[PDB]
Amino acid sequence: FDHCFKKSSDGFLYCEGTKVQDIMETVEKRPFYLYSKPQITRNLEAYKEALEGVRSVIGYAIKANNNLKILEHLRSLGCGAVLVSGNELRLALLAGFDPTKCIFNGNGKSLEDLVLAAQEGVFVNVDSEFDLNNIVEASRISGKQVNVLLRINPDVDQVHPYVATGNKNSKFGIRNEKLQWFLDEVKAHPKELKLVGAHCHLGSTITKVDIFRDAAVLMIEYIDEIRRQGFEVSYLNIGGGLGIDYYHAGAVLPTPMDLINTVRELVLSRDLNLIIEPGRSLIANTCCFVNHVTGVKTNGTKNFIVIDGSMAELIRPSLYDAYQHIELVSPTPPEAEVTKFDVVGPVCESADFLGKDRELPTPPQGAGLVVHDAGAYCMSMASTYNLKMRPPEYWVEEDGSITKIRHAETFDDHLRFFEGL
């Protein structure tokens, strides 16, 4: 297993060379998210090495994790920013992203947000007829021409239905039979639009690189037709959606190299800039959600590890029936009875669980427990549900040092919303 979070022979969990027990003891006894900064570097360098010889933008999907320190680090390594909202663009500019490496996607881009997009000069995809009319009005208000990409549905349908974005009947991209309508409209707005490319995103947790190859071939047919109607196209955006190993049992998964190798010769043969939009595959595997065990109990013949963390800070398992690996931070006295636990949070409800049916040694009270691979769509999807206030974030750097990269939310951060009313 290649992974930044490793259980020594001793039975201690480490993040790089630092013992998680040790960090747990130097921080507030409430849940926290812990990152390896080095694993962030390693994840980008795999894509950068994969894209050698291809003119390319690596678009970090900011939706996956919006920690300002993490954006600042990805941006220093030459990363681009993919953006689904105006606040995401705003954060991308404070992080110091180059606007000509930013791409603004979405199926409901507001006029106020398209105006910011236009004045800053970012790429803007085109998802619908109403989107186009909005991007046109945005250009008028901003007085800047807008580099657009047609987001096109390739009609390519094997992934959780809540993260399937390329399929027939998703809310994403234009109709295929209506491509000509978009090309005619763009040519009718030479002041306001400059068509520079085609965009697709197929979904998330994809583990089958064939679907990227089959997609890229359909996208090159459309770029070839667009080029022949006299449009100057520089860019193909195949998006993100590359999966990672959530199961921690040595599974061999498609690398960034495997993914680029499927479209390398087709892209090079058309002298296209490739835009990739990885979120999960850049950030997910760099991070544990660190909990304390509260107690252990039994309803009839299921068994329960009750932890301080919950669906408030980490909703992915409940929301998608997703597996994230669970294991203890410190070694157990070996007279404990290894049996099958459901791992649940302090909220009394059936959706408040972080994993089901997990063979583990019975933990003592106050024992560290982690959920692995919680760098993506975990903190970013977090609520204050049951007033479990959002956790702090720490990372481990090259030198073995521990730095807080996000203040913990307090109960006072809830009262701020009612001051003076």
Ligand X SMILES: Cc1ncc(COP(=O)(O)O)c(C[NH2+]CCCC[C@H](N)C(=O)O)c1O
Cβ nearer to ligand X, comparing 24 with 81: 81
How many binding residues for ligand X (CB under 6 A)?
24
Task: List the structure tokens of 165.
Answer: 């974005």
Site for ligand X in 18-47 (CB under 6 A): none
Cβ–Cβ under 8 Å, residues 216 and 275:
no
- Residue 82 in the binding site for ligand X (CB under 6 A): yes
Confirm or deny that 173 is annotated as ligand binding.
Answer: no
| 250 labelled binding-site residue | no
Q: From 101, 115, 3, select the one nearest 55 (Cα to Cα).
A: 101
Active site residue 348: yes
Nearest to 385 by CA among 318, 326, 322, 296: 318
Q: Is 413 in the site for ligand X (CB under 6 A)?
A: no
Q: Which of 15, 102, 287, 348 is catalytic?
A: 348
The neighbour count for residue 192, using CB atoms within 10 Å, is 21
Helix or strand holding residue 269 (H, E): helix 264-269
Q: Does 239 bind ligand X (CB under 6 A)?
A: yes
Closer by beta carbon to ligand X, 283 or else 307 = 283
SS3 state at 159: coil
DSSP string across 52-88: TTS-EEEEEEGGG---HHHHHHHHHTT-EEEESSHHH
Q: Is 316 annotated as a binding residue?
A: yes
Q: Is 278 annotated as a binding residue?
A: yes
What does the alpha-carbon distance between residue 327 and residue 331 come to, in Å, rounded to a whole number?
Answer: 10
- Footprint on residues 343-382 left by ligand X (CB under 6 A): 348-349, 376-377
Binding partner selected for residue 316 from its own copies, ligand X, none, CB under the kind-specific 5 to 8 Å limit: ligand X
Cα distances (angstroms) measured from residue 336 to each of 19, 78, 344, 360, 363: 23, 49, 20, 10, 8
**Cβ distance to ligand X smaller for residue 31 or 106:** 106
Residue number, 214 or 342, with CB nearest to its own copies: 342
Q: After which residues is the chain broken (C to N over 2.5 A)?
A: 157
Q: In whole angstroms, how far apart are CA 104 and each of 85, 93, 207, 224, 356? A: 7, 13, 26, 24, 37
Instruction: For the CB of residue 377, give the shortest distance to its own copies in the complex, in Å.
Output: 8
Nearer to ligand X, 304 or 320 (CB): 320
Measured in whole angstroms, how far is the alpha carbon of residue 335 from the centre of its chain?
A: 41
User: Is 89 near ligand X (CB under 6 A)?
Assistant: no
- The footprint of ligand X on residues 272-331 (CB under 6 A) is 277-281, 316, 320
Q: Residue 241 Cβ, how far from ligand X at the closest point, in Å? A: 4
Active-site positions read: 348
Could you tell me which residues are annotated as the binding site? 241, 277-280, 316, 320, 349, 377
Could you tell me which residues are annotated as the binding site for pyridoxal 5'-phosphate? 241, 277-280, 377
Footprint of ligand X (CB under 6 A): 61, 63-64, 82, 105, 163, 165, 201, 204, 239-242, 277-281, 316, 320, 348-349, 376-377
